[PDB]
Amino acid sequence: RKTYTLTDYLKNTYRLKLYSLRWISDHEYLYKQENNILVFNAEYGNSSVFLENSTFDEFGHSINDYSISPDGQFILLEYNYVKQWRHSYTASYDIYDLNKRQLITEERIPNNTQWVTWSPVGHKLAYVWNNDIYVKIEPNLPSYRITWTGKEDIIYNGITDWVYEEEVFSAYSALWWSPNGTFLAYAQFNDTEVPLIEYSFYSDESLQYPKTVRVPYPKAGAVNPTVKFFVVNTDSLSSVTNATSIQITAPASMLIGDHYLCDVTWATQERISLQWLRRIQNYSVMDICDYDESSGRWNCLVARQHIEMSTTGWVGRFRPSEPHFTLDGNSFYKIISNEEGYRHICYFQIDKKDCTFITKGTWEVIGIEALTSDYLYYISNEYKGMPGGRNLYKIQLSDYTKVTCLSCELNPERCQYYSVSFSKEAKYYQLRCSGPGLPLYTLHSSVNDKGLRVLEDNSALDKMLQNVQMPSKKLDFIILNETKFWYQMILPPHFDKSKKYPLLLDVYAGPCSQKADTVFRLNWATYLASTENIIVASFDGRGSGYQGDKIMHAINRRLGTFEVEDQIEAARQFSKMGFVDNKRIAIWGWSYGGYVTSMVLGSGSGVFKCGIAVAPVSRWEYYDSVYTERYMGLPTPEDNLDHYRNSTVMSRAENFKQVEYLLIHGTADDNVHFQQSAQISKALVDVGVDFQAMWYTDEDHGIASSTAHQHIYTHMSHFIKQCFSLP
């Protein structure tokens, strides 16, 4: 039959169909069928029309995105959306009064706000404009100003700077409503002393003089931004009185030196929890503070602090886990590594330092999704001992002995990677299977775990794919020393066990990452396997996780040493199956994958014929402070400067002489600056090694613009074709 061509990827002929719902109650959810918003009752499946299909909601501007108030009375509509960072963007907002007929035209939200959020209940609004926080109690009332210190690129009130957005919070928003909606907590970031990275932006062709973009960006060993934390009582706002912000001071053990705020979670209506982290990622602290009605301040008693310390490595996977509090708020559950180096769920009382583990075994609990008074639901990879699987289990609050799986037998062949979205109060939950078979979205009732109905099965996609030569996926393990390590291979269809197939290695190999799992993807590797008949392999090495801390922390303070050797070893063991051609082997990777690809090519093994690095990291002093210092500490002569200088790509530049290298980097990359690729090019030039290069002007780290996406992928495909001599 016909195969999956490159154009099929590029033109998205095979569209993955999703079923995204938003619970607005304990038994009803919204869904944008067509572009109108239907409301669905879970128990019967009957549907009605919440918002009618028409240009009436905005009229005159293309509608980008919308948000429904919790009470369903108002709709917030945004247009003129302009993305700036990964999560940073600006747009204009209007409020449509869904209650009777019309838009609200008085006291409209400004034409350049950076972020807008509803209260959890009611219809309050909080937005950020010119780095200042403004609050509207009612959509048709004038706004109340909360902050006055906002200043472009210097002070951020309620909004994150670049580094916190990208590496710490992984989200743009920096304000959190109270459960009842009375308190609004926010963070303020000061970047006065942060050095600015400057790069050229060319913009539209008609621009005569290129402009210089300056971004506050703390590199490894630079002055880090400072962070402060405040809360405001929204119920006390008055027209002729300045807003009052009560400050919450960081714990004493934390603010000795540079420190970061990890995340903030509301416990009860007047109880809050904050996670702080030392700059040297160890000794994380959870603080719990209660509102004092007599004293507007927040008293954080010493006995309610909880400490997290690591020895073999750093704290947490990427960030200390957020606690899930009980209804009363006097106890909670947290994911924490055990004495055997495995992550499990510990039950904490707010006044006790000792945690009682409720799960145990040679596996890791991935996440707590929902908490009731009698059952706790979680995602874990215990099933079949497969690190690349995810399943839903529930445990009784009373007796921890009883553990029941809710997804193990639902569809074993088509599902090993489950995710779940619970309704309010957890009467119902939607299950999403993203495992080996086509993704499947279903709805179930928690009361008696009965399957209710199939929401989305992608049946049309299955019928279309029945005429297409799809590849196969194999997941297995190889034993190195006294430990097994997992790997996956995308095999071309009609895979012959006797023929010699070429092997292309997709490598991210980043710490805590995982490239070998059961997730179904249709991407570039799929086209390679289907049309070009290339076996695409990925391997989990010694910083890869969901597997333990014995494996996870093996690369602590020695980045780029054990992972590279592990990739080399994986290739070597892959060599002796009859399906791998030793002469033609290549390693490609993106970002950190590019760094690993470059270091592997500079290893001198001679196994790999060629390699592609897309925006590779070249010298860890060039990267941002938080990410690098998580694994490497500070680059000072007394602490770790020796390993910083030794682990550069440039120092291995001469080893590139035997291999063919392809380097790609966008000029407007705000994440991995062009400087890294420029330095690699300089080293290769003055060592006299030939190579290929490709720059994409005005493109960011993701190279997500449509045309740039097409061009980069066809260029990489052409390069792979010539290197493997596929034509």
Partner: protein, 209 residues
């Protein structure tokens, strides 16, 4: 001779943690002046009454004065567990006390400092990983060990000062945090008055024939 109130009217008003103390023995005070130099907002007395300091003779008076915003009137209140008693000023309930939060009139020559301030956290952090917090709480009538980080006041609200402690001090990095409160139109002050009996053979009296 007349009681010397002059030191209270020279220089910037002291802060709540850096309060100042005046001990009166063998002197007479003019009540006419004290009635006019201040506007009392609250007279709060424990085991004592104002209508008896102003008409009786005592072996000793002790006045602790500081600059205190009226807005935080009850935070200093006795039996409160707020920052103020923990790190700034704890007045013994057993000591007879007449805590007075008042307001200095415009023409009275008491210099207004910059914005008010109080010590949010004073802690003796110690431990191998610096894990132990071990907070330090002032005993009644005792200045905070975090008094000298910035004696004048706090330059910006939420300020941190870290000073290593030697073995005589007890070891570990002493840590302090300071909070800043905007100054009002009129300088507002707090006074703690204590009367001591049988502490000598001379007395403090109101000026009278």
């Amino acid at each position: 001779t007349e009681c010397d109130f002059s030191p209270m009217f020279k220089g910037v008003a002291p802060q709540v943690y850096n309060f100042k103390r005046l001990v009166f023995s063998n002197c007479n005070y003019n009540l006419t002046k004290l009635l006019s130099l201040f506007a009392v907002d609250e007279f709060s007395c424990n085991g004592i009454s104002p209508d008896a300091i102003a008409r009786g003779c005592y072996s000793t008076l002790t006045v602790d004065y500081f600059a205190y915003p009226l807005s935080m009137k009850s935070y200093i209140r006795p039996g409160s567990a707020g920052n103020i008693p923990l790190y700034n000023y704890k007045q013994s309930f057993a000591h007879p006390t007449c805590r007075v939060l008042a307001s200095v009139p415009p023409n009275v020559t008491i210099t207004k400092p910059e914005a008010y301030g109080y010590i949010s956290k004073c802690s003796r952090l110690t431990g191998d990983y610096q894990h132990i917090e071990t907070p330090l709480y002032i005993n009644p009538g005792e200045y905070s060990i975090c008094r000298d980080f910035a004696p004048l006041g706090f330059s910006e609200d939420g300020q941190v000062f870290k000073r290593t402690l030697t073995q005589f001090e007890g070891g570990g990095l002493l840590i302090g945090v300071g909070t800043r409160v905007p100054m009002t139109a009129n300088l507002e002050m707090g006074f703690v008055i204590s009367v001591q009996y049988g502490a000598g053979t001379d007395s403090v009296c109101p000026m009278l024939d």
